């Protein structure tokens, strides 16, 4: 049997539960796979090059997490599937000696979600995949962000874009910023309170602890959900891509969910 190398690129990366759930799958499916796969956390400098590192490390496949998903989109040799509409790549696979990118956040988020409009906080890789997905489900989408960079993408999708918080009600209030993992609110506390009091679901992408955003939803008795189901769904989808589409995602998902 041959060894194959995988990982997850990020900064920070120490929080990531992607190694745990993937490694479990690589062991569970080793015979099917006919290789011995191992998945590492990989802390990348803010100014390194995703493609060069992937190649230098000899990876067969990787995930990409904050703050690299839009950069991954720019450096792939080839993009496939819905990533072509996401402006963001979270899944890398070496295919035909080329670095190919995919996006599993869009469908992972779809699957994780059991609504007519949405407010997305955040403009980065995760927010782009989400906005693309929600617009496809027929939702109205508004995007509120700190900065005005990277908003052409949301305008062309047909979203309403803001730097000043709109005074209107949103069913879904989604925290797709990286504030939580640096552990601060994505927005002013009082503004956020008003959104929650009229909202139906507070959704934070961060997983593994109670974020300031979700603690405040909790405090107000607004229904809330963290990033765990999305993590596992996108992970499974990626694993399917890692396997060259041999292991079906639903098979990975059951192993990942239990570990
Ligand atoms: N459910 C799950 O398990 C998943 C969760 N998500 C999570 O979503 C988060 C975002 O990831 P990703 O999109 O790749 O990261 P990016 O670095 O691509 O984007 C992060 C965004 O958050 C914004 N932001 C950061 N700090 C603040 C702040 N204090 N206030 C308002 N906005 C802020 C940034 O704005 P600016 O440009 O102004 O800095 C940027 O728009 C991460 O925590 C990631 O783990 C991602 C995938 C899966
Ligand atoms: O925390 C993680 O390990 C990840 C989170 C999301 O950004 C995913 O998109 C990424 O592929 C892996």
What ranges do the domains of the chain cover? 1-104+235-259, 105-234
Nominal resolution (angstroms)? 2.0
Label the pairing between strands 172-175 and 160-162.
unpaired
Backbone angles phi, psi at 111, to 5 degrees: -60, -40
Tokens of 22: 């993937």
Q: Is 158 exposed, middle or buried (0-12, 13-18, 19+ CB in 10 A)?
A: exposed
Q: Classify strands 140-144 and 160-162 as parallel, antiparallel or unpaired.
A: parallel
Q: What is the dihedral of CA 46, 48, 49, 50, to 10 degrees?
A: -60
The dihedral sign for the CA sequence 150, 152, 154, 160: positive
Ligand 2 neighbourhood includes 177 CB (under 6 angstroms)? no
Pairing state of beta strands 91-95 and 61-64? antiparallel
- In the structure encoding, which two tokens stand for residue 94, read together? 């070496």
User: Residue ranges for the binding site?
Assistant: 16-18, 65, 90, 105, 122-126, 178, 205, 207, 227, 234
CATH number of 105-234: 1.10.8.60, 2.60.120.10, 3.40.50.720, 3.30.465.10? 3.40.50.720
Q: What is the DSSP string of 208-220?
A: SS--HHHHHHHHT
Q: From atom 43 of ligand 1, which residue's Cα is the shortest distance away?
A: 178
Long-range contacts of 65-68 (CB under 8 A, 24+ apart): 65/8, 65/9, 65/10, 65/13, 65/16, 65/18, 65/90, 66/10, 66/11, 66/124, 66/125, 66/126, 66/178, 66/181, 67/10, 67/11, 67/124, 67/125, 67/178, 68/9, 68/10, 68/11, 68/44, 68/125
- Cβ–ligand 2 distance for 105 under 6 Å, the answer yes
CA dihedral 128, 130, 131, 136 (to 10 degrees): 130
Say if CB 178 and CB 67 are below 8 A apart. yes
**N residues, the chain:** 259
Q: Is 162 helix (H, G, I), strand (E, B) or coil?
A: strand
And the tokens for 130?
């989400």
Token code pair at residue 248? 């079906």
The residues, ordered by sequence, that sit 6+ positions from 160 with a Cβ below 8 Å of its Cβ are 140, 141, 142, 143, 166
For residue 117, what are the β-bridge partners?
A: 140
CB atoms under 10 Å from CB of 181, counted, come to: 19
Determine if residue 171 is left, alpha or beta; phi over 0 gives left, psi from -120 to 50 gives alpha, anything else beta: alpha
The candidate with the shortest Cα–Cα distance to 116, out of 93, 142, 96, 91, is: 142
Neighbouring residues of 130: CB distance < 8 A, sequence distance ≥ 6? 105, 106, 109, 120, 174, 176
Is 197 marked active-site? no
Q: From residue 183, how far is each of 85, 150, 207, 214 by CA, in Å?
A: 30, 23, 12, 11
Class of residue 205 by CB neighbours under 10 A (exposed 0-12, middle 13-18, buried 19+): buried
> What are the DSSP E strand ranges found in 29-159?
35-43, 61-64, 78-79, 91-95, 98-102, 117-121, 140-144
Q: Does the beta carbon of 16 lie inside 6 Å of ligand 2? A: yes
Separation of CA 167 and ligand 2 centre (Å): 32
CATH architecture of 1-104+235-259: 3-Layer(aba) Sandwich (3.40)
Q: Identical fold at 1-104+235-259 and 105-234? A: yes
Ligand 2: nearest atom to the Cα of 108? 9
User: If 0-12 CB within 10 Å is exposed, 13-18 middle and 19+ buried, where does residue 183 land?
Assistant: exposed
Helix (H) or strand (E) holding 232: helix 228-242
State whether the beta carbon of 180 lies less than 6 angstroms from ligand 2. no
Half-sphere exposure of 70 (CA within 13 A, CB side): 12
Number of other residues whose CB lies within 10 A of the CB of residue 14 = 8
Q: Using the 8-state DSSP alphabet, how is residue 82 labeled? A: G
Among 69, 128, 241, 251, the active-site one is 69
User: Are the C-beta atoms of residues 32 and 246 closer than 8 Å to each other?
Assistant: yes
Distance, CA of 49 to CA of 68 (rounded, Å): 10
């Amino acid at each position: 049997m041959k060894l194959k190398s995988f990982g997850v690129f990020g900064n920070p990366i120490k929080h990531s539960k992607s190694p745990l759930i993937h490694n479990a799958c690589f062991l569970t499916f080793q015979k099917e796979l006919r290789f011995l796969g191992h998945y590492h956390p990989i802390l990348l400098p803010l100014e390194s090059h995703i493609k060069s590192e992937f190649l230098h490390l000899g990876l067969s496949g990787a995930n990409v997490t904050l703050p690299f998903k839009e950069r991954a989109f720019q450096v792939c040799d080839k993009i496939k599937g819905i990533a072509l509409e996401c402006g963001a790549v979270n899944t890398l696979v070496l295919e035909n000696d080329e670095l190919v990118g995919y996006n599993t956040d869009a469908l992972g988020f779809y699957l994780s979600l059991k609504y007519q409009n949405a407010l997305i906080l955040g403009a980065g890789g995760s927010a782009k995949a989400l906005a693309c997905e929600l617009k496809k489900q027929g939702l109205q989408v508004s995007v509120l962000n700190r900065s005005s960079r990277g908003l052409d993408f949301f305008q062309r999708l047909g979203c309403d874009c803001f730097m000043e918080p709109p005074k209107s009600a949103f069913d879904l209030i989604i925290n797709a910023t990286s504030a939580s993992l640096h552990n601060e609110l994505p927005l002013n506390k009082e503004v956020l309170k008003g959104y929650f009091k009229e909202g139906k679901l507070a959704y934070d992408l961060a997983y593994g602890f109670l974020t300031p955003f979700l603690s405040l939803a909790k405090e107000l008795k607004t229904p809330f959900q963290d990033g765990k189901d999305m993590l596992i769904y996108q992970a499974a989808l990626s694993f399917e891509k890692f396997s060259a589409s041999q292991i079906p995602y639903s098979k990975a998902f059951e192993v990942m969910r239990s570990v």
